[PDB]
Design a protein around this ligand. Structure first.
Ligand SMILES: CCCCCCCC/C=C\CCCCCCCC(=O)O[C@H](COC(=O)CCCCCCCCCCCCCCC)COP(=O)([O-])OCC[N+](C)(C)C
Ligand SMILES: CCCCCCCC/C=C\CCCCCCCC(=O)O[C@H](COC(=O)CCCCCCCCCCCCCCC)COP(=O)([O-])OCC[N+](C)(C)C
Ligand SMILES: CCCCCCCC/C=C\CCCCCCCC(=O)O[C@H](COC(=O)CCCCCCCCCCCCCCC)COP(=O)([O-])OCC[N+](C)(C)C
Ligand SMILES: CCCCCCCC/C=C\CCCCCCCC(=O)O[C@H](COC(=O)CCCCCCCCCCCCCCC)COP(=O)([O-])OCC[N+](C)(C)C
Ligand SMILES: CCCCCCCC/C=C\CCCCCCCC(=O)O[C@H](COC(=O)CCCCCCCCCCCCCCC)COP(=O)(O)OC[C@H](O)CO
Ligand SMILES: CCCCCCCC/C=C\CCCCCCCC(=O)O[C@H](COC(=O)CCCCCCCCCCCCCCC)COP(=O)(O)OC[C@H](O)CO
Ligand SMILES: CCCCCCCC/C=C\CCCCCCCC(=O)O[C@H](COC(=O)CCCCCCCCCCCCCCC)COP(=O)(O)OCCN
Ligand SMILES: CCCCCCCC/C=C\CCCCCCCC(=O)O[C@H](COC(=O)CCCCCCCCCCCCCCC)COP(=O)(O)OCCN
Ligand SMILES: COc1cc(CNC(=O)CCCC/C=C/C(C)C)ccc1O
Ligand SMILES: COc1cc(CNC(=O)CCCC/C=C/C(C)C)ccc1O
Lengths: 598, 289
């Protein structure tokens, strides 16, 4: 009976198996007998697997027995052996004929564990170097290293897929990455594993850069290997050293400009769901690269753009200033030179407006941002787009015989000038100040203004339900104002004599002053102090990221003027390679010094 | 053993050790008996006693208790349901944490009279954190938002009826045939009904909770304020059928407190609840000094 043998194997006794074997020959889930045996195995107490294998051999078609349920769909006995750190059973299964099995079930894709869908990926992802060595070098059937799973994740893909940014996890993930990469080199010196890409097309380096795994990225970018056979695996090199001085190179294989999305363009354009996209510009080559680009070929472009915006704002201001006032829009052009100048200024203004409108639309299309985090990812794109909207609405209402266009233009102009702060990112000690303004406007004023409006409305309704109006203080707008003024140090504790009782009125105003002016407002000062003292450092990081985005956008914009004139680094030969005795890369040089090493 | 702990590391250490040893010994000597169920004159189980007295260490121990011995695996309160790689899925007992015979652990932690040293860290134990978050996620967030919306509507109609109070003569006022006057009187009746609701809620809270007189502004700052708003509303009612125009001096107060009390509902949101807590603490200490 099937249940009798199941009970026996769970009992770890072979007596029933021995009794039934002669009769065996004489004659939902789908779990295999050997599968249950290894599952119900303690201290190697399960030996009936060998008996079952020998019985089957005495009778290929069984060494590939796999689960069927959607939860464990495809789960294989080799995977079960590996999960338990089984070497003897794994080797026995491999020799007997039981390495490219695909465990495409849900559990391997809710609560679950992802390692890839191959035995090699499982063995690597579980910190088992010896087992992966044997699996990839098993003589009966060698486990392939280039096998590709459903979503495309190979073993290196998976190793990136598993990190968590911790010290020990990053430690052994990097260790196994290095070992498996050297092993793939020696077994297949012709192949280059890293180039492989998943369904999304992201290289493991690009994947570790997008997902947020800084440790793996720092590793991959700072990678050098000395072995004579496989020195081509390096991305870093040392070009000389004299005393305590050194001069190293870096690879920049496709960091600068890559096939689809390089590392830098993916770090900068991360949608802020990533944990740390701000520390991820701390790696040495990226810091040096951004500083170099800023120094050489984009500081002048940024200052030119800033000067052009300043001039645009000056003419917009000085044309809006002299707007015609008599009659209705439009206005008939006078023969005077000044009127010509004014209309030229207006046309310049509207041209800038449409430019900014199209830039905003294009940014939206390319970037495809969310709706909940749109005021955290990009605070300034929204504001430039809004200024453009106001300018265009004013245009719409200036050819529509209406004088409300000014109410638009004013707004626009204000935003215009206030937006000059956008350009204070090219300077550190001002960019950090603008970042702090950003953060406070987003958090502190929102909280404080909700609470303050609750208090103000409560007490102003309480004070208009008292007045009787028997000027026109019997208003909720005018009471809302006269009580707002208290906050700006202009509150007149007696602004009206229309009230039944004086004690109630004055107790009401005193409670309001004590609760908002003395308590709340000084509390806001205190909370601003604490928030400043916290974000002192995150502001620097966000400024760095802002400037990085500025550099990337500028280089993308003027690819027409100089698409390849400004390439980072120099095309150098670091060394030879066994493949073709050629190793020429666009490498980047940095010096260094040290005294302890000597 | 619960009666002796002091929340220190070593005292908690050996108190837990001896608790475990004596419990296993009682199991082996008397496998039929269950010691924990026993209760003192007050009727509090040792777990409930360690939860009420403030002994967080002993509570964390008792709630996170598992035993592997074949004979006495029934002593566990925690279990492991599977593990595949680096992953695990554990269970917890909740014997009578949720709803217990007289006073469960949770109802006794929450309702501690603040004489207890640390009733705020005592919700840091894993099962209680997870339980509170789960309940909030599933079946009470909607109820809280519904109550908050109802209070907002009550406050809006109270405000907009108090706003248009009749001004000529003395109270009461003869209902005009105008539709607006009908609307106004309906609003007033709604207001007073809410007022009596809040008054009875305050009285019931006092009776059940039996708080002190020196620490009444530390234990519950908002029950007092809701009760006071109800008192002002009821006094205004008393002076609106007593031919007197001082009722307004009451109502105004009431309304103010009303709107200011909306902050009570900012506890369902973390970054606003913390702000309201800070307002509470400053009003209690700094403004007084
Ligand atoms: C393209 C240029 C447009 C920019 C300015 C156009 C202003 C014309 C209005 C005008 O002449 O109105 C007249 C008064 O105008 C004046 O007399 C004032 C001129 C001083 C403005 C100089 C500051 C510019 C910074 C450098 C009266 O109408
Ligand atoms: C002068 C009239 C408008 C120019 C203002 C302007 O674009 O500001 C500058 C012209 O900088 C340029 O390089 C564009 C020049 C092309 C305009 C030619 C059309 C004239 C007819 C734009 O400066 P910017 O800071 O690159 O724009 C940032 C706008 N976002 C991305 C923040 C939305
Ligand atoms: C139950 C409902 C009671 C709540 C409102 C009762 C107001 C009646 C007073 C009245 O009509 O007086 C008349 C003026 O009243 C008006 O013309 C003002 C009406 C605007 C109020 C809308 C805001 C409500 C939010 C949504 C004059 O008496
Ligand atoms: C609308 C008129 C009054 C309702 C306002 C009110 O109770 O606020 C809401 C009606 O929430 C309810 O679920 C009660 C509904 C019953 C009322 C029916 C009587 C109508 C005749 C009460 O909301 P809450 O926040 O539960 O009250 C907290 C009050 N304490 C505990 C802080 C004192
Ligand atoms: C006009 C061109 C401005 C040249 C920028 C030099 C620079 O970037 O300075 C860094 C920060 O300084 C600043 O406060 C920048 C302020 C510049 C004036 C802004 C006013 C704009 C009005 C037009 C630190 O420099 P560092 O620490 O020495 O490295
Ligand atoms: C109306 C329903 C409001 C939905 C609440 C969502 C939530 O609870 O948000 C947490 C805190 O957010 C907030 O500032 C809450 C503010 C909500 C608006 C209050 C205005 C009331 C006027 C009526 C943190 O969330 P998290 O960190 O992502 O976890
Ligand atoms: C970089 C510069 C840094 C600091 C310089 C600040 C001094 C700016 C003074 C602008 C002069 C001014 O207000 O002109 C008035 C306003 O003119 C404008 O609208 C120019 C606006 C440009 C502002 C940028 C500086 C003249 O109008 P009126 O005669 O009052 O009628
Ligand atoms: C959630 C909403 C968050 C923010 C919205 C704030 C805007 C509220 C404006 C209320 C309109 C108002 O004042 O109406 C006036 C007052 O009406 C009221 O009393 C309604 C009170 C409800 C306030 C809740 C918001 C109309 O009276 P009048 O014509 O001045 O005499
Ligand atoms: C443009 O980029 C930035 C801009 C700012 C300053 N601008 C603001 O804070 C927005 C204020 C808008 C107020 C306009 C009100 C009108 C309706 C009268 C700080 C950091 C930046 O990165
Ligand atoms: C209702 O619960 C809360 C309420 C508040 C704010 N409310 C207060 O501070 C009380 C102020 C009362 C002032 C009234 C004065 C009248 C006499 C004119 C903070 C935290 C909470 O938990």
């Amino acid at each position: 009976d099937r249940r009798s043998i199941f009970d026996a194997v769970a009992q770890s006794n072979c007596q029933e198996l021995e009794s039934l074997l002669p009769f065996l020959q004489r004659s939902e889930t789908g779990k295999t007998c050997l599968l249950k045996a290894m599952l119900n195995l303690h201290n190697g107490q399960n030996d009936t697997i060998a008996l079952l294998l020998d019985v089957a051999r005495k009778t290929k078609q069984f060494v590939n027995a796999s689960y069927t349920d959607s939860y464990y769909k495809g789960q294989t006995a080799l995977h079960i052996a590996i999960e338990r750190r089984n070497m003897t059973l794994v080797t026995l299964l491999v020799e007997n004929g039981a390495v490219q099995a695909a465990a495409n079930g849900d559990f391997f894709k809710r609560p679950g564990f992802y390692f890839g869908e191959l035995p090699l990926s499982l063995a690597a992802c579980t910190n088992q170097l010896a087992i992966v060595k044997f699996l990839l070098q098993n003589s009966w059937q060698p486990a392939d290293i280039s096998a590709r799973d459903s979503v495309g994740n190979t073993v290196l893909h998976a190793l990136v897929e598993v990190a968590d940014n911790t010290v020990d996890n990053t430690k052994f993930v990097t260790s196994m990455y290095n070992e498996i990469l050297i092993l793939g080199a020696k077994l297949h010196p012709t192949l280059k594993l890293e180039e492989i890409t998943n369904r999304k097309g992201l290289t493991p380096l690009a994947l570790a850069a997008s997902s947020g795994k800084i440790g793996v990225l720092a590793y991959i970018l700072q990678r050098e290997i000395h072995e004579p056979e496989c020195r081509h695996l390096s991305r870093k090199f040392t070009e000389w050293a004299y005393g305590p001085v050194h001069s190293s190179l870096y690879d920049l294989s496709c960091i600068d400009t890559c096939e689809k999305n390089s590392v830098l363009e993916v770090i900068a354009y991360s949608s802020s769901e990533t944990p740390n996209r701000h520390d991820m510009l701390l790696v040495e080559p990226l810091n040096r690269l951004l500083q170099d680009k800023w120094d050489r070929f984009v500081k002048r472009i940024f200052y030119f753009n800033f000067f052009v915006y300043c001039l645009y704002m000056i003419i917009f201001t000085a044309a809006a200033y002299y707007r015609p006032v008599e009659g209705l829009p439009p206005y008939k052009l006078k023969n005077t030179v000044g009127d010509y100048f004014r209309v030229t200024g207006e046309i310049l203004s509207v041209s800038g407006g449409v430019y900014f409108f199209f830039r905003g639309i294009q940014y939206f299309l390319q970037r495809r941002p969310s709706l909940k985090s749109l005021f955290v990812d990009s605070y300034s794109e929204i504001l430039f787009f809004v200024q453009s909207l106001f300018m265009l609405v004013s245009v719409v209402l200036y050819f529509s015989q209406r004088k409300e266009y000014v109410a638009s233009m004013v707004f626009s102009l204000a935003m215009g000038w206030t937006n000059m702060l956008y350009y204070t990112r090219g300077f550190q000690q001002m960019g950090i100040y603008a970042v702090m303004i950003e953060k406070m406007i987003l958090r502190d004023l929102c909280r404080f203004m909700f609470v303050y409006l609750v208090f103000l409305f409560g007490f102003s309704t309480a004070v208009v339900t008292l007045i009787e109006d028997g000027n026109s203080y019997n208003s909720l707008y005018s009471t809302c104002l006269e009580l707002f003024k208290f906050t700006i140090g202009m509150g007149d504790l007696e602004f009206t004599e229309n009230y039944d009782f004086k004690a109630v009125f004055i107790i009401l105003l005193l409670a309001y002053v004590i609760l908002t002016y003395i308590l709340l407002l000084n509390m806001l000062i205190a909370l601003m102090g604490e928030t400043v003292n916290k974000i002192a450092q995150e502001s620097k990081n966000i400024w760095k990221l802002q400037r990085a985005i500025t550099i990337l956008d500028t280089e993308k914009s003027f690819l027409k003027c100089m698409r390849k004139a400004f390439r980072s680094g120099k095309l150098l030969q670091v060394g030879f390679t066994p493949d073709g005795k050629d190793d020429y890369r666009w490498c980047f040089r940095v010096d260094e010094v040290n005294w302890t090493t000597w």
